[PDB]
Amino acid sequence: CLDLWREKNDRLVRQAKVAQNSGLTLRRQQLAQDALEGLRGLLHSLQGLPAAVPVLPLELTVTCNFIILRASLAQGFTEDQAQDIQRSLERVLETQEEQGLRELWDSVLRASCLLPELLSALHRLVGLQAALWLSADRLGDLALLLETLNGSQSGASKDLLLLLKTWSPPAEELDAPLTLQDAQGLKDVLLTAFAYRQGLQELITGNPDKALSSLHEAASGLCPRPVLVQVYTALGSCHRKMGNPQRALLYLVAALKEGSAWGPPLLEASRLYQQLGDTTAELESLELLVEALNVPAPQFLIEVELLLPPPDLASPLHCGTQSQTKHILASRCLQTGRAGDAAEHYLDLLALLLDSSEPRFSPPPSPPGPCMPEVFLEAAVALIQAGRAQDALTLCEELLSRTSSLLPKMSRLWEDELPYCPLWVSATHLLQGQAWVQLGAQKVAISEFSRCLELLFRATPEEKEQGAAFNCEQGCKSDAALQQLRAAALISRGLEWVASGQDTKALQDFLLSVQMCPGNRDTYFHLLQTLKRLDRRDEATALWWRLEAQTLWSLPLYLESYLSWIRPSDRDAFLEE
């Protein structure tokens, strides 16, 4: 009977290995699920008996070859495999000599120290359960288990990597029932995976000193070229944080050469050149990144990939999408002042996003980033600083033509805080307006500044009383974005009052913006220049002393950009006079 059970285990392992080496995307997973049902049925047949000693090292090799092929297909461990380990462990406990896995392991390793001749299978089971606890982020008790496997007098060795190095596999694995992987093949994987995760964690928590050690450890030994890339990239990051640029570059070069997947190196390249101020190459690198992200097999075995965590957003290994990136380029292009470049980039962003109905989805920048209407604004601010103002209007019009159904009906206009309009509307009227300044139309300019101002005061943007949809958390609610957007349109309109020669009305709007946002100084500049034109002394000095008494947190980009656009260079010169 155990002849037949072992022949079956061997048969299904040979099937699985044939599938891993050969086949196609279907036939692979077909033969894998065949073998998986086989191992399931055989496990149930073996678990039916009240196990003997000679049935036990077959049952554990089948348990391990079942959990292996389980996690290989699922592309992840789970708690069903923990309960399978528990089943096989209570089966080892009830043969000779219940509560939970930690004490079960302690007792089972005490029983293994009685030398039943299955320790080649026990070390493999420790490999799988250590891997489960590793993917489940249960590093503390893992140390306890491997500490119990080795001497208990090495209990002061809290560090997992020394402890895993000391953990020997026990035998050369003589003719037992066949297996998919050996315990040392699992040990190598455990080492690199644990080292890598510790190093990455140390990096994100700002110890890129300690990180080098752990990551060089991931490099030395079993490291698929794909993981080698990510190691070197993390090193780029660490050296870049230190201050050492050239070593950083070195690692990145190696990553590019070895890699078929060079998203992340160039992102670090970008952040690197950003530290130096090598603006030109920065934008060059991001242009390469775009083209790179244009271009696009799973083994029935436990490789390292399986045990690596998903990168965070804080990591150097988070690389967005083409769309999410091209947005990086244009945003970072636009804080420099390459409006022309910026503009191209933005149109290409917007082309991708809207025109995609037919191809694969190219998505928006995620909701830690700006919201999709904040992107149409960034497009427009770029287009104005180009001087493409007939385009900066086919933007603001397209936008409010799609979202009309949303916009407030402004019948509160007749009935005159209570109604609701989100800051991106009031802002589309701001930039629709400044586009008419570039074109030369005083009338429709002052129109649009007034319409912006009416939806700033005779509506509230913060009516999150009713969670009615999906919505902009960040960029549109900030009390910052309110007080500075008020100031913006008040000055924007004040300049058109100055153009017409109605400098009393201009004084009214400038005086209001001073009460509004006293930490702009663009406001105080325009006001004080008007007072210096008309009635300087007492008013001006009263505001001077205020400024010196007074003496950017999270402003949205299209607004920061707009302020930097309108502000005069001869600002401080005038303010010290």
Partner: protein, 233 residues
């Protein structure tokens, strides 16, 4: 259906995405949506489906999420809903579409896929906004959101042409329950010069056992006793 005794076995060649753990799935144009049970977390995915008449393939999965919100007889259910301008799903009206999902999906002209969950939670996700990779995992807290929690499981989701005065642009959104809370939803734009949603948690009879929609705000549903209709129009 061409398909080169009147019984026919399928060969496993006809298998595509042998995911094995998949409970629900729906269809858009050129895009395929599954929704797959795992540990605690259920994950919606999104694959291609080859637009050329080739070998019938999945493609590469475009993206994946975890419906973190759900931790587990009743299968959950999937309905897509495209907005006006842009197929076996439903179209809503621009007012509504903007009302439920927000500007983003309006601006993208992005289909939005409603999952009904055994919990009774009725969750939408914007599809555009779900394209990820190994480098780039989807955050569910961002990316999946939750309309309204019927306390009981879901049976049938649709939408209706109230005020009817093949592609009809509907103005109301329909759920149903097992025990028989319905929830139809509407655009109002009323009493504050501002758009508000019109919720209506009715209470029908019994176990509800299926549903459908017929022309003109008429929902053909079934209890254990009887096949009964409701009018909203």
């Amino acid at each position: 259906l061409d398909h080169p005794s009147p019984v026919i076995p399928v060969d496993p060649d006809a298998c595509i995405l042998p995911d094995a753990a998949l409970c629900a799935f729906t269809l858009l144009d050129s895009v395929l949506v599954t929704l797959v049970q795992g540990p605690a977390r259920w994950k919606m995915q999104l694959f291609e489906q080859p637009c050329p008449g080739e070998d019938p393939r999945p493609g590469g999965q475009i993206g994946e999420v975890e419906l973190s919100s759900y931790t587990p007889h009743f299968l959950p259910v999937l309905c897509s809903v495209s907005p006006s301008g842009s197929s076996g799903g439903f179209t809503l009206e621009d007012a509504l579409f903007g009302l439920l999902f927000g500007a983003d999906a309006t601006l993208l002209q992005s289909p939005v896929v409603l999952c009904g969950l055994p919990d009774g939670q009725l969750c939408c996700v914007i599809l555009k906004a779900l394209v990820t990779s190994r480098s780039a995992p989807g955050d569910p807290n961002a990316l999946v959101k939750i309309l309204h929690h019927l306390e009981e499981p879901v049976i049938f989701i649709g939408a209706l042409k109230t005020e009817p005065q093949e592609d009809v642009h509907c103005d109301c959104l329909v759920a149903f329950g097992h025990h028989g809370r319905m929830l139809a939803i509407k655009a109002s734009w009323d009493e504050s010069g501002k758009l508000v949603p019109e919720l209506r948690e009715y209470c029908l009879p019994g176990p509800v056992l299926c549903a459908a929609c017929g022309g003109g705000g008429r929902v053909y549903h079934s209890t254990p006793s009887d096949l009964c209709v409701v009018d909203l129009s």
